[PDB]
Write a protein that binds this ligand. Structure first.
Ligand SMILES: [Ca+2]
Length: 1019
């Protein structure tokens, strides 16, 4: 029963002996000999490979174990396995911190698993560099083989470095490479208003009850409230706030109260409150918010008196041409802009080529100013030449783009400064490429215009770049003079005329009569004789008046035989200004009251009179001609402005367009490209407080401030790169958590208070459209759309699940969110009862928005996460922990394969086959079982049981093996045949041409495998 070794004396353990026709194998434990021909194949034998199924399965189904968003799984998912291959060798029970990538064990298809291996080989070095790339034809079992080795190598590197930080860098880099999980499947398009690459629209679904909303009305601009006309562009930037939702509508009213009472809310201050608001993107939001803002302003401020209304002058950013109508119909709660004068001035004077006829300035506007002598007749409006977002934002950016070649997507301060340098040099040039022509000429018309409030842009007084008021522009001296002249002289009716002498409808005459006179035939009151103004402007630099042609300033019957001094004159190099009466060239009117100018110079008692002749000029200041004439003998303290009436208005409008309305001037007190201060003294709001009286000196009554909200600094759009204040995370944060680009909340309060003491209004930039960069993640059902909201051409993210950044808001959003709705409902109950048009129902204060979510948003900008970023199964079923939808996880995390496969299977005639964890028939591979037996499967996957010396190639293992009739490869022992005794090492490989030391014995072997000499040796 036992073979006992002659040399050692011990019974032979693990020994095979041939005796004629019989083969006897001796036991490895004791040495009991049984017939090797009758060796049984194990009945319920399982592979050591199935130890992975036990370990790689998830620890549990909790937030702690498996990382999840809203319930679902993502491509960048770490999970907690049951066991860890510590150093890629030993299975160990996982701790709470042991987190592994889901893509290490799971793949959506075999193709991406092949792409996984190729990426982890090249960029990861977790596979041999000599190993070839895996194609689409690669064997699924072979792909499973190498991917399992990658796990071993991953765990090896973790045991060496002690980090998992390199993994999150490597796995995220892999995710972004596939067209499944990046911007490739996003349909990235920059059509029109799609600044950030396009938009995704949130939709109601069973899969995401969080994303559900009964409202979400799109394109509800002022013209399209009732949805009667065409719907506008609802989506603009970042996370588009749903303003159809009455819960949000109440929150917007709550936020409006916060801005209008800021000083009281934060520091119990009285004079540190905003008096008016600027509606940011009115044509992009649900225009219900206009009526809500109207309802509050009529109830809290009670705007039915000219004296009360003109102390709170609200304005709109309505670029729509049909908007002045609607806002006039609803009673002008906020002032509509006059885009028509802007077009008439820009295309008439500012254009580089093919200027408009200057008839446009006269006729094309909300007020025809040819013979305007009537009051309270036109739509109350504000007008401007340039703004922060208009006629600058794109040009300045182009200057940076030309000098350095960079977008707002990374340029640094240095490259921003280089662009500004080129922009200001261009500004101070005769031929301009980025700057508008005839700025002083444009402003000379604007500030002398009747039936409109003018708005002076910051970038026209101070440089668009630099620190706040660090540098003054070229046009500073002229505009400041014109603004001071407006206070003294500009009043009464207006008269305008055009000549066709040089070009076609060039050369314009602009005349104001002064307080007391409306028409030309009006003789005027007492004050009229020194009031009024005369402006001559031409747009052609080629202008050469005829020897007989004369330009006439018809000052009217009020100014018969008066003396007029020069205020602004055009020279060959630039312009000359005169602030006082002394030093200025003088001109006289006739019996009719006409100031004659011609091709020849003016003459007083035999004098040349400086530069007084009307002719075409070409210099950095004027590309045409400019002249401003002013009556002499004016008081030092003269004020042409008329006081607002305290009478109750019988009409149904918030603002009347009288002369007292014309007394106001708005200052847009910022450019988008102001530099972020380094010193405390370089802060914008500190300097506004210091120069508070100076802003009154120019005649500014309404002071439009920059949006004081803290920037997101995400560099997704321009508003977050230079930090305007239009790109914010926290709506209620006004330099409170950290100082913004303009200063702290204390600096802001000081600025507002100083302006109130100087006798000015202060405007809050109300931005109810979007919220930038939110910290929390959420899964919502989306649809790829355009700016208006229409489904994209061939949208591949149509009704797909997507991870969006909607959760968040900030500290002060959580503090003041809906915190004033309780007081507002008690104070003014009429606001909360009024049924909103478009919504159908009134605003809803019952829910306070302290934290934002997908419910309160209409949509989002494209996020480049991928259309298949939310993990779904092979046949299209989204993986979930059971929170939102039915619990479903992959076969890897549960850890139980079931089909006609896995482990060892006997298939009728085909002997024994092996199927791996996935269920693929394995060929040319050695498979070790749970106990420690290696079985080989040939080129057909059939188990070998020959008992003959068979050569195997396998996975780079060139060697000769021996297979018993049970299926096990013989290893670590001797086989005695009729040809001699043969030895096989611990791996089943036959030892040849070597003297080896096995146990207590030493075996010498030749090039045939036969034993030469077996000897015992100790010590
Ligand atoms: Ca919107």
């Amino acid at each position: 029963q036992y073979y006992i070794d002659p040399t050692t004396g011990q019974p032979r353990k693990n020994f095979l002996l041939q005796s004629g026709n019989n083969w006897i194998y001796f036991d490895s434990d004791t040495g009991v000999g049984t017939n090797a021909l009758e060796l049984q194949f194990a009945k319920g034998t399982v592979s050591s490979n199935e130890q992975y199924r036990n370990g790689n399965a998830a620890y549990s189904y909790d937030d702690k174990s498996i990382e999840n968003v809203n319930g679902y799984l993502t491509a960048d998912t770490w999970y907690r396995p049951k066991q860890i291959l510590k150093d890629g060798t030993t299975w160990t029970d996982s701790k709470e911190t042991d987190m592994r990538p889901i893509l290490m064990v799971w793949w959506p298809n075999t193709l991406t698993q092949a792409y996984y291996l190729n990426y982890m080989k090249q960029h990861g070095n977790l596979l041999p560099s000599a190993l070839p790339f895996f194609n689409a034809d690669a064997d699924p079992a072979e792909l499973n083989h190498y991917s399992e080795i990658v796990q071993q190598n991953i765990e090896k590197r973790i045991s060496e470095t002690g980090n998992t930080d390199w993994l999150r860098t490597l796995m995220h880099d892999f995710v972004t490479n596939n067209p499944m999980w990046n911007k490739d499947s996003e349909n990235v398009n920059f059509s029109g208003i799609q600044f950030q690459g396009g938009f995704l629209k949130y939709e109601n679904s069973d899969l995401t009850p969080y994303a559900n909303s009964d409202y979400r009305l799109l394109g509800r601009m002022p013209i399209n409230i009732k949805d009667q006309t065409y719907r506008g562009q609802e989506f603009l930037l970042a996370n588009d706030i749903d303003n159809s939702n009455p819960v949000v509508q109440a929150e917007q009213l709550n936020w409006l109260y916060y801005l209008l009472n800021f000083g009281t809310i934060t520091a119990n201050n009285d004079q540190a409150n905003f008096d008016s608001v600027r509606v940011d993107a009115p044509d992009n939001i649900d225009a219900d918010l206009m009526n809500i803002a109207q309802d509050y302003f009529n109830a809290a401020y009670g705007m039915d008196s000219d004296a009360v209304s003109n102390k709170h002058i609200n304005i709109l950013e309505d670029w729509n041409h049909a908007d002045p109508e609607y806002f006039n119909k609803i009673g002008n709660p906020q002032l509509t802009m006059d885009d028509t004068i802007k077009n008439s001035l820009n295309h008439g004077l500012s254009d580089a080529t093919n200027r408009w006829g200057l008839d446009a300035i006269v006729h094309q506007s909300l007020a025809d100013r040819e013979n305007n002598s009537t009051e309270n007749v036109v739509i109350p409006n504000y007008s401007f030449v340039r703004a922060h977002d208009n006629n600058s934002q794109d040009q300045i950016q182009n200057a940076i783009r030309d000098v350095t070649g960079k977008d707002y997507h990374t340029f640094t301060f240095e490259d921003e400064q280089k662009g500004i340098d080129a922009y200001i040099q261009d500004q101070n040039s005769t031929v301009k490429k980025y700057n508008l022509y005839n700025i002083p000429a444009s402003y000379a018309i604007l500030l002398t215009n009747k039936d409109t409030i003018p708005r002076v842009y910051y970038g026209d007084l101070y440089t668009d770049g630099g620190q706040y008021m660090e540098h003054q522009t070229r046009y500073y001296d002229t505009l400041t003079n014109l603004l001071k002249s407006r206070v003294k002289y500009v009043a009464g009716g207006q008269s305008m005329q055009t000549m066709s002498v040089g070009g076609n409808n060039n050369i314009l005459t602009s005349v104001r009569y002064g307080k007391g006179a409306m028409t030309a035939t009006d003789t005027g009151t007492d004050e009229t004789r020194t009031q009024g103004i005369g402006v001559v402007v031409s747009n052609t630099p080629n202008l050469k008046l005829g020897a007989n042609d004369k330009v006439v300033l018809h000052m009217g019957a009020a100014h018969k035989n008066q003396q007029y001094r020069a205020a602004v004159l055009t020279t060959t190099d630039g312009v000359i200004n005169y602030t006082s009466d002394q030093g200025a060239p003088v001109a006289m009117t006739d019996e009719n009251g006409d100031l004659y100018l011609s091709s020849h110079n003016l003459v007083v008692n035999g004098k040349e009179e400086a530069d007084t002749a009307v002719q075409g000029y070409a210099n950095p200041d004027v590309s045409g001609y400019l002249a401003v004439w002013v009556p002499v003998g004016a008081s030092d303290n003269q004020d042409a402005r008329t006081a607002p009436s305290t009478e109750k208005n019988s009409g149904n409008s918030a603002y009347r367009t009288n002369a007292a309305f014309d007394s106001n001037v708005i200052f847009e007190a910022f450019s988008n490209f102001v530099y972020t201060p380094t010193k405390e003294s370089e802060r914008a709001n500190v300097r506004i407080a210091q120069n508070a009286d100076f802003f009154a000196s120019l005649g500014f009554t309404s002071f439009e401030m920059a949006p004081q909200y803290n920037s997101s600094k995400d560099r997704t759009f321009l508003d977050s790169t230079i930090d305007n204040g239009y790109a914010f995370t926290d709506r209620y944060d006004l330099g409170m958590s950290e100082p913004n680009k303009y200063g702290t909340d204390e600096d802001l309060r000081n600025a507002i208070q100083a302006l109130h003491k100087a006798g000015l209004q202060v405007m809050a930039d109300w931005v109810p459209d979007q919220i930038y960069n939110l910290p929390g993640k959420e899964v919502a059902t989306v649809t790829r759309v355009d700016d208006r909201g229409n489904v994209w051409k061939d949208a591949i993210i149509n009704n797909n699940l997507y991870v969006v950044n909607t959760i968040g808001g900030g500290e002060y959003q959580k503090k003041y969110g809906g915190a004033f709705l309780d007081k507002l409902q008690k104070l003014y109950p009429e606001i909360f009862t009024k049924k909103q048009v478009s919504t159908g129902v009134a605003i809803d204060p019952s829910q306070k928005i302290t934290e934002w979510s997908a419910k309160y948003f209409n949509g989002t900008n494209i996020l480049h996460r991928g259309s298949g970023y939310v993990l779904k199964a092979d046949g299209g079923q989204y993986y979930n922990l059971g929170t939102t939808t039915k619990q479903f996880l992959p076969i890897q995390l549960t850890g139980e394969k079931k089909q006609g496969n896995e482990g060892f299977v006997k298939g009728n005639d085909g002997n024994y086959y092996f199927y791996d964890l996935a269920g693929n028939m394995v060929k040319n591979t050695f498979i070790e079982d749970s106990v420690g037996n290696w079985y080989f499967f040939d080129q057909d996957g059939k188990m070998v049981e020959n008992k003959h010396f068979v050569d195997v190639d396998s996975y780079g293992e060139k060697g000769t093996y021996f297979f018993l009739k049970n299926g096990v490869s013989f290893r670590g022992g001797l086989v005695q045949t009729d040809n001699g005794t043969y030895y096989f090492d611990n791996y089943g490989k036959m030892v040849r041409n070597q003297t080896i030391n096995a146990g207590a014995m030493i075996y010498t072997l030749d090039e045939n495998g036969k034993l030469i000499k077996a000897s015992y040796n100790s010590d």
